[PDB]
Amino acid sequence: VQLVESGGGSVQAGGSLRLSCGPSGYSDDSRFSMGWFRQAPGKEREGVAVINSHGDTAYADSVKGRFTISKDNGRNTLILQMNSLKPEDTAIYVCASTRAYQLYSGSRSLRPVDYDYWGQGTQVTVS
Amino acid sequence: ESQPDPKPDELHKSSKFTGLMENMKVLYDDNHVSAINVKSIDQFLYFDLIYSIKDTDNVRVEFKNKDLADKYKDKYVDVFGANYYYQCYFSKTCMYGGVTEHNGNQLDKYRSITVRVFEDGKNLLSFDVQTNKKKVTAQELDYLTRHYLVKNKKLYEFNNSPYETGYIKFIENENSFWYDMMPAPGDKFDQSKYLMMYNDNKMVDSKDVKIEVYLTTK
């Protein structure tokens, strides 16, 4: 499994960015969970938003109502739509995913340890 | 250091159990003990503590040794565990371990921990359990894990189980340990004897601990 992010960049406070990740290595009917994590300059990696295999989501409190995670089935992309960006949102954002399950991947964990695959990370700067 | 993973012949096989599986099931049904910020009011033996907890009355917590009892005797604690009545004595419900200091152990929010379920070596499903504790007893996480699997996979039924074997594995960085989820073979199953495995009050960090369940079918 490979995770390749795009859509990073920089905006003024109040702005918007749209992160995207196309996972390779899964089957068409693989049931897995996916998430967006970020790591600010001298801080631990933190879970931002996650979606499980049947489309339920969870978010870190600091981004609720501003960021939206979704999965485009037809395009095979995970999206993080980031609105109302703040300087505090500046970080390296990274996509993460789990192994696949037969029945369902119900987990919506925001803990890094719970993911099995990681992308390369993409810079977001708000200033 | 790390407990070695179970070889297949080290695991209890439900088909060698001829007792009533209901007596296991009820331990992991809805009802359990849960108290927030309580202090022991009494002690019967040197390895227990007694609390006054509301049912919605008195809970005897048994520990593996005196040092555990002494550590928590005068502390405000949280209590979480599977409890029993049959052969519960003190001179009314009983449990083992399940005790954590209240102060400094509270998270702001509930925190989700992945449970990965394997069936016959295959990735079957994942779900989450939640806790608001920094340090949580393995007992608490074990109960929550099995409660989910009872509801959603009929892990335990009245008579028997659809699964031949089952163990839960906790992984904390380098170290791991596991519990056998099936009853010992034979006709007899004693709740008090089974639950005593929790009497070490073993704790894990909710930040780091990973949970895995291995099931095999018949």
DSSP B6-48: PPGGGS--GGGB-S-THHHHGGGSS--EEEEEE---B-SSTTE
How many residues belong to chain A? 127
Q: Which helix (H) or strand (E) holds B208?
A: none
Cβ of B210 and A114 within 8 Å? Answer: yes
Compute the radius of gyration of chain A from its Cα atoms: 14
Looking at the structure, tell me whether residues B116 and B160 fall in a common domain.
yes
> Is B112 within a domain?
yes
Task: Report how many Cβ contacts below 8 Å link chain A to chain B.
Answer: 52
Residue type present at position A127: S
Residue spans of alpha helices (H) in chain B: 22-25, 66-72, 138-153, 191-195
> Which residues 6+ apart lie within 8 Å of A122 measured at CB?
A5, A6, A7, A8, A19, A92, A93, A94
Tell me whether strands A77-82 and A67-72 are parallel, antiparallel or unpaired: antiparallel
Residue B194 is assigned to a structural domain of this protein:
yes
Q: Report chain breaks in chain A, C–N > 2.5 Å, as residues after which they occur.
A: none
- Close Cβ partners of A66 (under 8 Å, ≥ 6 residues apart): A82, A83, A84, A85
B13 and B73 belong to one structural domain: no
Copy the structure tokens of residue A5. 């992010």
Do residues B107 and A86 touch, judged by C-beta distance below 8 A?
no
Which pair of tokens denotes residue B145? Answer: 């894990």
DSSP symbol at B4:
P
Q: How far is CA A74 from the centre of its chain?
A: 18
Please indicate, yes or no, whether residues B50 and B82 belong to a single structural domain of this protein: yes
Q: How far apart are CA B140 and CA B209, in angstroms?
A: 13
Domain identity same for B116 and B187: yes
Experimental determination approach used:
X-ray
Residue to mutate among B114, B152, B210, with most A CBs inside 10 A, is: B114
Indicate the length of chain B as a whole number: 218
Beta bridge partners of B112: B130
What distance in Å separates the CA atoms of residue B105 and residue A127, rounded to the nearest whole number? 36
| CA nearest to A20, candidates A75, A85, A87, A58 | A75
Q: Do B207 and A111 touch (CB under 8 A)?
A: yes
Count of Cβ atoms closer than 10 Å to residue B18 Cβ: 13
Question: Domain for residue B190, yes or no?
Answer: yes
- Clarify whether residues B23 and B79 are in a common domain: no
* DSSP-assigned letters across all residues of B46-100: TTEEEEE-----EEEEE-SSHHHHHHHTTS-EEEEE--B-TT-----EEEE--EE
State how beta strands B210-217 and B106-119 pair.
Answer: parallel
Residue A27 CA to residue A54 CA, distance in Å, equals: 16
Q: What is the resolution of this structure in A?
A: 2.0
**Residue A19 and residue A6: Cα distance in Å, rounded?**
6
Cα–Cα distance between B85 and A14 in angstroms, integer? Answer: 60
Contact A26, A100 (CB under 8 A): yes
Judge if B13 and B114 occupy the same domain: yes
* Tokens 């989910």 found at: B148
Which residues of B have a CB under 8 Å from any CB of A? 109, 111-117, 119, 122-128, 207-208, 210
Residues 6+ apart with CB under 8 A from B127: A106, A107, B114, B115, B117, B148, B152
The domain in which residue B146 lies consists of 8-28+104-217
All domains of chain A, ordered by start, with CATH?
A: 2-126 (2.60.40.10)
Last residue within a domain, chosen from B101, B127, B157: B101
Please state whether beta strands A67-72 and A57-59 pair in parallel, antiparallel, or not at all (unpaired). Answer: unpaired
What's the CATH number where B183 sits? 3.10.20.120
Report yes or no on B85 lying in a domain. Answer: yes
Q: Which residue in A77, A28, A32 sits closest to A52, CA to CA? A: A32
**B182 within a domain of the structure (yes/no):** yes
Cα distance between residue B76 and residue B39, in whole Å: 5
Question: Left, alpha or beta for B173 (phi > 0: left; psi -120 to 50: alpha)?
Answer: left
Last residue of a domain, one of B43, B70, B101: B101
Q: Which two tokens stand for residue B202?
A: 């073993």
- Beta bridge partners, A92, equal A39, A123
B112 and B203 part of one domain: yes
CATH number at B44 reads 2.40.50.110
Residue contact A99–B207, C-beta within 8 A: no
- Please calculate the CA angle A110-A114-A115 and round it to the nearest 5 degrees: 95
Alpha-carbon span B126 to A100, nearest angstrom: 9
Q: Which of B50, B83, B101 is the last residue of a domain?
A: B101
Question: What is the tally of structural domains in chain B?
Answer: 2
Residues B111 and B129 both lie in one domain: yes
